[PDB]
Amino acid sequence: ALSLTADQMVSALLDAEPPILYSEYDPTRPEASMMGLLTNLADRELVHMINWAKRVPGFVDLTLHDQVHLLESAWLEILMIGLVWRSMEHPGKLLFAPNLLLDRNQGKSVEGMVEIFDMLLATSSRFRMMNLQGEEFVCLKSIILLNSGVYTFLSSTLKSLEEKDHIHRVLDKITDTLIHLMAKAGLTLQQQHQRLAQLLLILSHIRHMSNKGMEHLYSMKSKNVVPSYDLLLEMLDAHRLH
């Protein structure tokens, strides 16, 4: 897993991509329905996200507790970068699903999105201006999975030191993979390091948007909206019986 080539890593990540899901509304029927639609869509995406995470090279080498911690920290960032990616070719709008495309004025009335709708649109625009490639996108999504929770392993066991070292080794292999993609494309070494930094700085903005989103979700005080550690544990703690 730490022995994949860059091309093999990219191939693995592309193979592991989850599907784009639909909103569950009757398209023959005529608000506050937006949060209901989004909550339902995110619930169904989360199941596929768990399957995807298990195929990110290196991720299933971690303990199940550490897998759960990472997913707990990252899942809304991962939903949001997917949203931004799908919206890249739809300026001024967010493609929540192929049947749920909203513009900014419509977003103005979506619960919890008073700040974040415009932040997501700006991110999508930035991706378009950089001409972000699918291979780069899947690298960034893997980086979020591995990085977002790594500085909150409040554990100091020998095993935890081993876990963090591994996570940093996988992150390093993804950095190498991103650089290789840029070299294949013919970028100079200076352009490669500049572009690597541009992409990684966007991750800080995705964290920001996720924190603002999570603030809203907790404010709802709805028992099942933020996935619990124990729920994520049940989905990740698979048997081998299938």
Next chain:
Amino acid sequence: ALSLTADQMVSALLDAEPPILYSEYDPTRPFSSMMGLLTNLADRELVHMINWAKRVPGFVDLTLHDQVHLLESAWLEILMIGLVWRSMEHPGKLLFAPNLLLDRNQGKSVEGMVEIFDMLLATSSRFRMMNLQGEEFVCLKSIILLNSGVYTFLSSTLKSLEEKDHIHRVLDKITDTLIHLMAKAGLTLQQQHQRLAQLLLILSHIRHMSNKGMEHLYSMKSKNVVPSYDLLLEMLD
């Protein structure tokens, strides 16, 4: 400022460093008051932060309104990365000021720090394990200033496009500078790109910690605690 060499950029940033300030308490009186000490310390740091920002190459080429927007987004991240930096050589503790060093158990009783004390300690430990250098630290703090608010200008005027392009040129020049520092130190090209990414990924964690801190500050409902756009505007004028 887009014509500085990497070495000149580093010297400029090192020259521009703000001082380390002290907490204001009677060192002869007992101890227990932490949020009051920290809000006062942050208030006095903010004035020096504005002077520092104006010496970050490229920053004053921006409009006043865009300078305010950047500082409004970034100022707690900038305070927090400074805190993490001065705590690097104090494992298990946070050096809020040279006269205000608290351990983890003491942090347990500090308002608003139920989550972020441990997060700041983890960041300091990560800086120590990477052997972060002062030259790298000042580059990262400048990146935070230029990056944190750049995807929230919510403007598409020709002037705004010009402003965003400039911000990214300055960011690109700091990336070049970071890479040059790593090359001077003898890192291979592979080690350079890996270390650049490690450093920039820590910035996401600094954003996380600032958002958690800002949530607590807004919860205080204290009129002067979160600096207003208009207050920052007066200081930046």
